[PDB]
Amino acid sequence: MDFRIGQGYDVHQLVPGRPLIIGGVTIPYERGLLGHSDADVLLHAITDALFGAAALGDIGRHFSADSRALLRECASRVAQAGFAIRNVDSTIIAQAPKLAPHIDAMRANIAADLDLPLDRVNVKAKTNEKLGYLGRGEGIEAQAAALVVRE
Amino acid sequence: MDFRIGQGYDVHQLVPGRPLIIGGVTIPYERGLLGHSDADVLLHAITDALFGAAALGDIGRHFSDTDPRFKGADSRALLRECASRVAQAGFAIRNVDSTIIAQAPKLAPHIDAMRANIAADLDLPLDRVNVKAKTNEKLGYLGRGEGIEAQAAALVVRE
Amino acid sequence: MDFRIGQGYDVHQLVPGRPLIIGGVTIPYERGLLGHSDADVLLHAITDALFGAAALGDIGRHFSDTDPRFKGADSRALLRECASRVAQAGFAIRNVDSTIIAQAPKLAPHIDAMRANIAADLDLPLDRVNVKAKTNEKLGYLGRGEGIEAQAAALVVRE
Numbered sequence: 001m002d003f004r005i006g007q008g009y010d011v012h013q014l015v016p017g018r019p020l021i022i023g024g025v026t027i028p029y030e031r032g033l034l035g036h037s038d039a040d041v042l043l044h045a046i047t048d049a050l051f052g053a054a055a056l057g058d059i060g061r062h063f064s065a066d067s068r069a070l071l072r073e074c075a076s077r078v079a080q081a082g083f084a085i086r087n088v089d090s091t092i093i094a095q096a097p098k099l100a101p102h103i104d105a106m107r108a109n110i111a112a113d114l115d116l117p118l119d120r121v122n123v124k125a126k127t128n129e130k131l132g133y134l135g136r137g138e139g140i141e142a143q144a145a146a147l148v149v150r151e
Numbered sequence: 152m153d154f155r156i157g158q159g160y161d162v163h164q165l166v167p168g169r170p171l172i173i174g175g176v177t178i179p180y181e182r183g184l185l186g187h188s189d190a191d192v193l194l195h196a197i198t199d200a201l202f203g204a205a206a207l208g209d210i211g212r213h214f215s216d217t218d219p220r221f222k223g224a225d226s227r228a229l230l231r232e233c234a235s236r237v238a239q240a241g242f243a244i245r246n247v248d249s250t251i252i253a254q255a256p257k258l259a260p261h262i263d264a265m266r267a268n269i270a271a272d273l274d275l276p277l278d279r280v281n282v283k284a285k286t287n288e289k290l291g292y293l294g295r296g297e298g299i300e301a302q303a304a305a306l307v308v309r310e
Numbered sequence: 311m312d313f314r315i316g317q318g319y320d321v322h323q324l325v326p327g328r329p330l331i332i333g334g335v336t337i338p339y340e341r342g343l344l345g346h347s348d349a350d351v352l353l354h355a356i357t358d359a360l361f362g363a364a365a366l367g368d369i370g371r372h373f374s375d376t377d378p379r380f381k382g383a384d385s386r387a388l389l390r391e392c393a394s395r396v397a398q399a400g401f402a403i404r405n406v407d408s409t410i411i412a413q414a415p416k417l418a419p420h421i422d423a424m425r426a427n428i429a430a431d432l433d434l435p436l437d438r439v440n441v442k443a444k445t446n447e448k449l450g451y452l453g454r455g456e457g458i459e460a461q462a463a464a465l466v467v468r469e
């Protein structure tokens with residue numbers, strides 16, 4: 001039937017003085033992401049991918065509240081435009097800290113916010129092999145892909 | 152149904168003495184994108200996503216500087232030709248999504264015009280075309296305003 | 311039908327004294343990619359996109375660098391095992407698209423061979439596999455030839 005794809009990108013600076021929150025999970029680290037609220041780079045990328053699949057513009061056009069509430073509101077808008085979410089996949093690029101321990105928590109948060117079965121939500125983690133601002137630990141990036149169907 | 156997905160990436164340097172053209176829209180700005188044609192980074196990324204989804208290779212394999220048909224061609228003519236070759240391969244386009252990463256200028260006022268241009272070029276309804284924008288939070292070459300990147304995703308179906 | 315999409319990213323440093331192996335192809339070059347495995351940036355990205363489409367985590371979850379077999383590992387053997395697990399999870403692969411970003415060497419002469427390797431490893435026909443190449447238009451650590459990046463997208467369907 002009427003499938004659509006969306007894609008998302010986000011990046012925030014990594015500096016001392018803020019908590020590190022990614023996919024709704026507070027992760028221990030000497031530094032944190034700089035941004036408007038929680039600065040949750042993963043949730044922002046996913047939100048963008050969903051708005052994009054629905055052809056509803058982008059996160060800034062809707063939301064001029066933490067990133068989970070934003071994600072839930074995004075999902076309601078996608079629903080009203082006539083779309084059902086089929087799956088989400090994503091990558092976090094961070095040289096440090098280790099994210100693997102926290103992946104299931106992020107997945108659970110995202111699945112809850114999107115009203116999706118856990119097996120339709122995935123989060124992957126990558127380093128930048130010490131290259132660039134990412135590899136020097138100066139920022140963290142997230143990428144997201146979402147598939148939806150008009151129902 | 153025989154669905155396929157494609158993904159595209161492009162980046163160009165921002166240089167003095169050239170117009171800034173993104174998604175077919177000329178945007179007032181002191182610098183423009185450097186490339187063999189208008190260097191429309193967004194249209195190029197979408198073009199690569201469509202060639203990718205149809206397993207037709209990539210933009211540099213289709214469009215040569217050398218080829219008389221495409222020498223003086225702008226990126227919208229190339230996007231139209233891409234759509235032609237996708238159709239020739241037996242595919243129909245279902246939707247396009249994309250992100251422009253530019254620290255500056257402000258792209259918001261231009262995005263609906265970009266969508267309209269892409270939709271016309273691809274013979275798609277407006278509600279199957281999407282364009283998003285992001286800054287790079289002052290990080291790296293994008294954050295320093297040295298270039299602008301575009302990312303695209305395309306879904307097609309073999310009919 | 312129960313379609314799912316996945317995406318993948320990888321990057322490795324380019325260093326002297328290593329084979330340059332991308333898409334399973336040994337490319338003549340004075341430098342190669344640095345990793346604990348054979349460091350095949352394209353196959354790793356594709357592997358992550360396939361695990362991601364199946365919601366099976368990521369390549370590090372599946373192939374531990376603590377396994378003696380990881381050192382110098384043939385990333386095509388890893389991709390085939392990835393495909394095996396994706397199948398075991400109940401998914402059939404519908405298509406793959408990808409981009410390699412490298413200042414050098416020229417990848418064009420090797421791309422069809424990469425596509426054939428990926429197609430063989432995933433038991434797909436050639437017409438469902440695509441590999442695209444880009445330079446980074448001289449920007450950043452990729453423009454300086456310090457590393458090579460790969461991006462991938464995969465579509466699967468749960469049978």
Ligand SMILES: Nc1ccn([C@@H]2O[C@H](CO)[C@@H](O)[C@H]2O)c(=O)n1
Nearest residue numbers: 060061253257258259284285286
């Ligand atoms: N160069 C840029 C970058 C971003 N934007 C818009 O700002 C909002 C927050 O990213 C988003 O709504 C985005 O569209 C913009 O107008 N120009």
Ligand SMILES: Nc1ccn([C@@H]2O[C@H](CO)[C@@H](O)[C@H]2O)c(=O)n1
Nearest residue numbers: 211212412416417418443444445
């Ligand atoms: N390192 C690279 C980068 C790009 N290319 C090929 O050049 C054309 C323009 O990106 C594209 O056709 C691309 O495939 C290449 O052969 N080697």
Ligand SMILES: Nc1ccn([C@@H]2O[C@H](CO)[C@@H](O)[C@H]2O)c(=O)n1
Nearest residue numbers: 094097098099100125126127370
């Ligand atoms: N910041 C990061 C980066 C990566 N990873 C995990 O380590 C594996 C190899 O990079 C990756 O495949 C991923 O499993 C992690 O846990 N935290």
Ligand SMILES: O=Cc1csc(-c2cccnc2)n1
Nearest residue numbers: 372373374377379380383387
């Ligand atoms: O999942 C186990 C594992 C870790 S490395 C590995 C492997 C390495 C080389 C060839 N075939 C397999 N297998």
Ligand SMILES: Oc1ccc(-n2ccnc2)cc1
Nearest residue numbers: 320354369370373374375376
């Ligand atoms: O267990 C691992 C470790 C590193 C890996 N990797 C880093 C960059 N590319 C693959 C993959 C799997």
Ligand SMILES: [Cl-]
Nearest residue numbers: 345346347349
């Ligand atoms: Cl490796």
Ligand SMILES: [K+]
Nearest residue numbers: 141300319459
């Ligand atoms: K990037």
Ligand SMILES: [Zn+2]
Nearest residue numbers: 010040041044
């Ligand atoms: Zn953000």
Ligand SMILES: [Zn+2]
Nearest residue numbers: 161191192195
């Ligand atoms: Zn271009």
Ligand SMILES: [Zn+2]
Nearest residue numbers: 320350351354
């Ligand atoms: Zn790798």
